[PDB]
């Protein structure tokens, strides 16, 4: 029993982290086979970051201008290219610690583990949800760029995020491993703001199933609701519409607990309309939306 | 910016996890050099766990009765001994992935990362504080025993916990790596309960400094307090006495922010007496006590 925000074991990703230095800018890179992937703004000076022309800055760099270090070993750069907002550095040595991997573009509402790194060295790991506004609530200081987000499925690492920047309110933005940003952000130091966020309904429902499994059942009412009436009520509380695809994804938790999804929707409807009356659910005084149905199943059945 | 509950990168510990099977009981072991450490109740059947005589059960086991598997390799057990509540299995192969390590007994109020494992396979990582009642708020299912807690200092892993059992309310108990339990618990399946817990004052203060660094400063009042008056007020809210050793440990955060510890104590005193008036601090509606001053410094200065 117990329910905690849990990250994937980071070992497979730790073995891929390297330091990339270009001139006087240093950040992290991800070394998979003979390629190192890193944010393209490693080629900028502080001044260039205000309004960079990456294509122009890159044409004046050669392979030798990129210094890649993996522990106490310098890797020789033998090729370079830019793909969207990431640079790919071909190196003369394939990473022997390369796990089985894939690059995936995650959807809003999904979670992943972040391995925060500085100077190519892993410092910590934590779980994030890709918010509906395409930001994550991370924790990153100067030099964290190139830190990656991932999921692990059996032996396979699905890399989904690479860190690039921090937005107002202390939220974070980045790209997939093909360098395409999540959200309408650009890698330039200019005024940018995230759009208004929304609560991930299907995740709040998943976390209510986690609470039931853990013995916190006070919020369970005796009613049911229709999907339409639930979505009409939940819209005013800035909750995402719950789709039939979301109801299907909640099926395993619903079957495990014997609580129909629409019955849990009636319990959530009452919690939204009446509040929690000073009570907690899994120790929280607020409804949590950063656990997916898979995250819950992972911990509440194995 | 940002502040998240963050675990240490688990790679160094993942390379030490093995599966230990004795008869029909399976749990996790920690393989360091040529020794595998695991909870002694691996030698029990379900029936033995109700009231076990470990010394008696162990005398009827030989080395061959312990099957240790590290990935796809079976390790041969060539010696065994029991030290308090842990069994030590000498194996014929030294773990080549053994990091630099030490065994430490952590103090109440301190935090560590837990690598939850099943069948010798790491599943997830999360941060815990050793509560003043010597329990942790973990997340463990059947088969999790032998999962370990640790801290990482530069290249050195300090192992401090090995998981043994779950107590009422879904809290967890275990031993140090010398097999001595934290708290007045025993490894027997009989009615046991944790003592009344207390709030770790120095950690709440550390987390208020984290909030200030992150720009959440609404709770800062214009007053100071004496240590005696702070401790008189905080006793009724079930907060641990704040000692001069705790005030000294908060020194780096106090110097970084320019807020004296006793001034933060006056702000905490007002929060305890008046509540948070529906407001949040670092997104939380409750005061958090599971971040040590070191955990805060780690994230709010690097
Ligand atoms: C990469 N190492 C850093 C990570 C930042 C540093 C503070 N916390 C983080 O997550 N990335 C940057 O410094 C990027 C980088 C230029 C400026 N920048 C920012 O994150 C800035 N943000 C923005 O300009 C904004 F709001 F548009 F997102 C900063 C004000 C420094 C936080 C580039 C190329 C975008
Ligand atoms: C080790 N694999 C498990 C981990 C437990 C299983 C459920 N969640 C966990 O943390 N440890 C045990 O099953 C230990 C083991 C016998 C019984 N036990 C317990 O944790 C039980 N608890 C107690 O009897 C109590 F309350 F005293 F702590 C159980 C009721 C199964 C949760 C031994 C030898 C203590």
B11 to chain A nearest CA, in Å?
Answer: 3
What lies within 8 Å, CB to CB, of A46 at 6+ separation is none
Whether the CA torsion A271, A272, A277, A279 is positive or negative: it is positive
Residue A7 forms part of a structural domain: no
Residue A6 forms part of a structural domain: no
Token pair, residue A85, equals: 């907002």
Token pair, residue A166, equals: 């921090």
Q: What are phi and psi of A111, to 5 degrees?
A: -110, 160
> Strands A17-22, B35-39: parallel, antiparallel or unpaired by DSSP?
unpaired
Residue A183 forms part of a structural domain: no
Residues B214 and B236 in one domain: yes
Ligand 1: centre distance to CA A21 (Å): 17
Find the helix packing angle between A293-300 and A201-213, rounded to 10°.
10
| Closest atom, ligand 2, to C-alpha of B173 | 28
CA dist., res. B121 & res. B143, Å (int): 11
Ligand 1: centre distance to CA A197 (Å): 20
Contact B166, A1 (CB under 8 A): yes
CA dist., res. A280 & res. A84, Å (int): 45
CA dist., res. B143 & res. B134, Å (int): 22
Find the helix packing angle between B261-274 and B227-235, rounded to 10°.
30
Contact B69, B120 (CB under 8 A): yes
CB neighbours of residue B120 within 10 Å:
21
A277 to chain B nearest CA, in Å?
Answer: 12
Looking at A42, A71, A91, the residue that finishes a domain is A91
Whether the CA torsion A128, A130, A133, A135 is positive or negative: it is positive
CA dist., res. A219 & res. A233, Å (int): 17
Residues A156 and A235 in one domain: no
Residue A292 forms part of a structural domain: yes
CA dist., res. B157 & res. B152, Å (int): 5
Token pair, residue A49, equals: 């970051």
Q: What angle do CA B116, B118, B120 make, to 5 degrees?
A: 100
Instruction: Give the CATH number of the domain where residue B282 resides.
Output: 1.10.1840.10
**What's the number of domains chain A is made of?**
3
CB neighbours of residue A297 within 10 Å:
17
CA proximity to A301, closest of A209, A217, A218: A209
Residues B168 and B210 in one domain: no
Q: Is the CB of A142 under 6 A from ligand 1?
A: yes
Residues A112 and A155 in one domain: yes
Contact A168, A129 (CB under 8 A): no
Residues B46 and B118 in one domain: no
Contact flag B141-A172 (C-beta cutoff 8 Å): no
Buried b or exposed e, range B157-177, using 16+ CB within 10 angstroms: bbbbbbbbbbbeebbbbbbbb
Residue B254 forms part of a structural domain: yes
Residues B67 and B140 in one domain: no
CA proximity to A89, closest of A77, A98, A97: A77
Give every strand in the sheet of B73-75, ordered side by side: B73-75, B66-70, B17-22, B25-32, B35-39, B86-91, B77-83
B221 to chain A nearest CA, in Å?
Answer: 23
Residues B209 and B284 in one domain: yes
Ligand 1: centre distance to CA B294 (Å): 25
What lies within 8 Å, CB to CB, of A143 at 6+ separation is A26, A27, A28, A118, A119
CA dist., res. B57 & res. B178, Å (int): 20
The gap between the terminal CA atoms of chain A, to the nearest Å, is 11
Write down how long chain B is.
Answer: 302
CA proximity to A139, closest of B7, B69, B95: B7
How far is residue B81 from each of residues A114, A275, A277, B35, B62, measured CA to CA in Å? 40, 55, 54, 11, 10
Contacts of A298 in chain B (CB under 8 A): 123-124
CA dist., res. B207 & res. B230, Å (int): 17
SS3 of chain A: the string is CCCCCCECCCHHHHCCEEEEEECCEEEEEEEECCEEEEEHHHHCCHHHHCCCCHHHHHHCCCHHHEEEEECCEEECEEEEEEECCEEEEEECCCCCCCCEEEECCCCCCCEEEEEEEECCEEEEEEEEECCCCCCECCCCCCCCCCCEEEEEECCEEEEEEEEEEEECCCEEEEECCCCCECCCCCCCCCCCCCCCCCECHHHHHHHHHHHHHCCCCCCCCCCCCCHHHHHHHHHCCCECCCCHHHHHHCHHHHHHHCCCHHHHHHHHHHHHHHCCCCCCECCECCCCCCCCHHHHHHHHCC
- Using CA coordinates, name the residue in chain B closest to A297: B141
CA dist., res. A162 & res. A182, Å (int): 10
CA proximity to A272, closest of A237, A227, A232: A237
Buried b or exposed e, range A277-290, using 16+ CB within 10 angstroms: eeeebbeeeebbbb
What lies within 8 Å, CB to CB, of A96 at 6+ separation is none
> Strands A156-167, A100-103: parallel, antiparallel or unpaired by DSSP?
parallel
CA dist., res. B5 & res. A269, Å (int): 30
CA dist., res. A122 & res. A17, Å (int): 7
Ligand 2: centre distance to CA B140 (Å): 10
**Exposure of A222 in the CB half-sphere (CA atoms within 13 A):** 0
Residues A86 and A106 in one domain: no
Looking at B91, B112, B142, the residue that finishes a domain is B91
Return left, alpha or beta for B50; rule: phi > 0 is left, psi -120 to 50 is alpha, else beta.
alpha
Instruction: Give the CATH number of the domain where residue A63 resides.
Output: 2.40.10.10
CA dist., res. A125 & res. B7, Å (int): 5
Residues A35 and A110 in one domain: no
Residues B229 and B293 in one domain: yes
Looking at B72, B91, B110, the residue that finishes a domain is B91
Token pair, residue B138, equals: 């973990």
Contact B129, A4 (CB under 8 A): no
Residues B291 and B213 in one domain: yes
Residues B147 and B237 in one domain: no
Token pair, residue B80, equals: 């065994």
Token pair, residue B238, equals: 């079930």
Token pair, residue A118, equals: 């500085």
CA dist., res. A1 & res. B21, Å (int): 23
DSSP string for chain B:
------BPP-HHHHTTEEEEEETTEEEEEEEETTEEEEEGGGG--HHHHTS--HHHHHHT--GGGEEEEETTEEEPEEEEEEETTEEEEEESS--TT--EEEE--PPTT-EEEEEEEETTEEEEEEEEE--TTS-B-----TT-TT-EEEEEETTEEEEEEEEEEEETTTEEEEE-TTSPBSSS--SSSS---PPPP-B-HHHHHHHHHHHHHTT--TT--S----HHHHHHHHHTTTBPPPPHHHHHHTHHHHHHHT--HHHHHHHHHHHHHH--TT--BTTBSS------HHHHHHHHT-
Q: Is the CB of A165 under 6 A from ligand 1?
A: yes
Our CA dihedral for A245, A247, A253, A256, rounded to 10 degrees, sits at -110
Whose alpha carbon is nearest atom 22 of ligand 2? B166
| Closest atom, ligand 2, to C-alpha of B144 | 2
B151-155, long-range: CB within 8 Å, 24+ apart, which pairs? B151/B8, B151/B104, B151/B111, B151/B112, B151/B113, B152/B8, B152/B9, B152/B12, B152/B113, B155/B99, B155/B100
Residue A255 forms part of a structural domain: yes
Give me the domain span that covers residue B70.
15-91
CA proximity to A10, closest of A125, A153, A174: A125
Buried b or exposed e, range B136-148, using 16+ CB within 10 angstroms: bbbbbeebbbbbb
Residue A3 forms part of a structural domain: no
Residue B124 forms part of a structural domain: yes
Exactly one of B16, B22, B38, B41 is catalytic; which is it? B41
Resolution, in Å, please? 1.5
CA dist., res. A185 & res. A83, Å (int): 16
What lies within 8 Å, CB to CB, of A283 at 6+ separation is B137
Mutate to test the pocket of ligand 1, among A136, A161, A189 (most ligand atoms within 8 A of CB): A189
Experiment used for this model: X-ray
CA dist., res. B118 & res. B19, Å (int): 8
Lookup result for tokens 């949040």: B280
């Amino acid at each position: 029993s117990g329910f905690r925000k849990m990250a994937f074991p980071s070992g497979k990703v730790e073995g891929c982290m390297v330091q990339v230095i270009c001139g006087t800018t240093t950040l992290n890179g991800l070394w998979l086979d003979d390629v190192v992937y890193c944010p393209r703004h490693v080629i900028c000076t502080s001044e260039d970051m205000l309004n960079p022309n990456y294509e122009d800055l890159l044409i004046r760099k050669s392979n030798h201008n990129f210094l890649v270090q993996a522990g106490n070993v310098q890797l020789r750069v033998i090729g370079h290219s830019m793909q969207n907002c990431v640079l790919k550095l071909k190196v003369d040595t394939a990473n022997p610690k390369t796990p089985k991997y894939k690059f995936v573009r995650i959807q809003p509402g999904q979670t992943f583990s972040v391995l925060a790194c500085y100077n190519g060295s892993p410092s910590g790991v934590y779980q994030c949800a890709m918010r509906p506004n395409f930001t994550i609530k991370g924790s990153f200081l100067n030099g964290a760029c190139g830190s990656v987000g991932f999921n692990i499925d059996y032996d396979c690492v699905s890399f989904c995020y690479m860190h690039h920047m921090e937005l107002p309110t202390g939220v974070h933005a980045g790209t997939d491993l093909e360098g395409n940003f999540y959200g309408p952000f650009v890698d330039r130091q200019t005024a940018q703001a995230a759009g208004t966020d929304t609560t991930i309904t299907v995740n709040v429902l998943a976390w209510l199933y986690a609470a039931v499994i853990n013995g916190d059942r006070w919020f369970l009412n005796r009613f049911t609701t229709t999907l339409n009436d639930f979505n009409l009520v939940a819209m005013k509380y800035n909750y995402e519409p719950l789709t039939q695809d979301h109801v299907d994804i909640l099926g395993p938790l619903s079957a495990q607990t014997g609580i129909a999804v629409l019955d849990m929707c009636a319990s959530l409807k009452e919690l939204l309309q009446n509040g929690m009356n000073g009570r907690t659910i899994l120790g929280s005084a607020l409804l949590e939306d950063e656990f997916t149905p898979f995250d819950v199943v992972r911990q509440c059945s194995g």
